[PDB]
A = this chain, B = another copy of it.
Amino acid sequence: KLTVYLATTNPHKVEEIKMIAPEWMEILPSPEKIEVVEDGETFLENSVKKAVVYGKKLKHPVMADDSGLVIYSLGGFPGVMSARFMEEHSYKEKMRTILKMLEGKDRRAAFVCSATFFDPVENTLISVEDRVEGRIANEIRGTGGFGYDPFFIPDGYDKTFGEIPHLKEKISHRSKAFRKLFSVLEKIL
């Protein structure tokens, strides 16, 4: 019933989103890579900006994700800088560096995801945000998911997303933000 192109370069993101989409959602890969200036202050701003740039060019309904790691004792770092921080380096160096940052510090943290729907024919835009609360692990563990998942432990668990990647589908920020986006969309039709 509703068909959408995904506004995203990230293949792990393509992956997570199709696997939690209801049957009434068809989620297609964008026919083209489109440069987006990601100069927003928040996940919401960047998510909307990707949805709008992609929507205007493709002239078809689109969905966008903007996401990252928020560490409370580091002022929300890396936040929107999640990818850009030490971007020439491996996620493993990034995680080691942030471990050094956190010695002696409260390790509370969250992955946040802003999920955006834009229909450029109707000029309807919907954006919702959700999060998964956890903590940074004392050490990098496991090879599942992507990015910072090897050192993030969701609340109510003692393993990292790198160790129990299947759990992302159930409780991660992206799963909940998009299910909450699907839910709104479902209602308004």
Q: Is the CB of B52 within 8 A of A75?
A: no
Contact-size category for A: 35 or more
Residues of B within 8 A of A77 (CB): 85-86
A10 at the interface (CB under 8 A from B): no
| CB interface residues, A 12-60, toward B, < 8 Å | 35, 37, 39-45, 48, 52
- Chain B residue numbers with a CB within 8 Å of A81 are 81
A85 to B85, CA, bound (A): 12
Q: Are A97 and B74 in contact (CB under 8 A)?
A: yes
| Complex alpha-carbon distance, A187 and B89, angstroms | 42
Contact B39 A41 (CB under 8 A): yes
Residue of B at shortest CB range from A44?
A: B123
Which among B39, B122, B187, B188 is the interface contact of A40 at CB below 8 angstroms? B39
A188–B122 CA distance with the chains assembled, in angstroms: 19
Q: Is A1 an interface residue (CB 8 A)?
A: no
A43–B123 CA distance with the chains assembled, in angstroms = 9
Q: With both chains docked as a complex, state the minimum distance between the C-beta of A183 and any C-beta of chain B, in angstroms.
A: 8
If A42-B123, A100-B100, A123-B129 are given as contacts, then 8 extra A-B residue pairs at C-beta distance below 8 Å, sorted by A number, are: A39-B40, A74-B86, A77-B86, A100-B103, A116-B125, A125-B126, A125-B128, A184-B188
List chain A positions with a Cβ less than 8 A from chain B: 35, 37, 39-45, 48, 52, 74-75, 77, 81, 84-89, 97, 100-101, 103, 114, 116, 122-129, 183-184, 187-188
21 pairs across A/B with beta carbons < 8 Å?
A39-B40, A43-B123, A44-B123, A44-B125, A48-B48, A74-B86, A75-B85, A75-B86, A75-B87, A81-B81, A97-B101, A100-B100, A100-B103, A101-B101, A116-B125, A122-B128, A122-B129, A125-B126, A184-B187, A184-B188, A188-B188
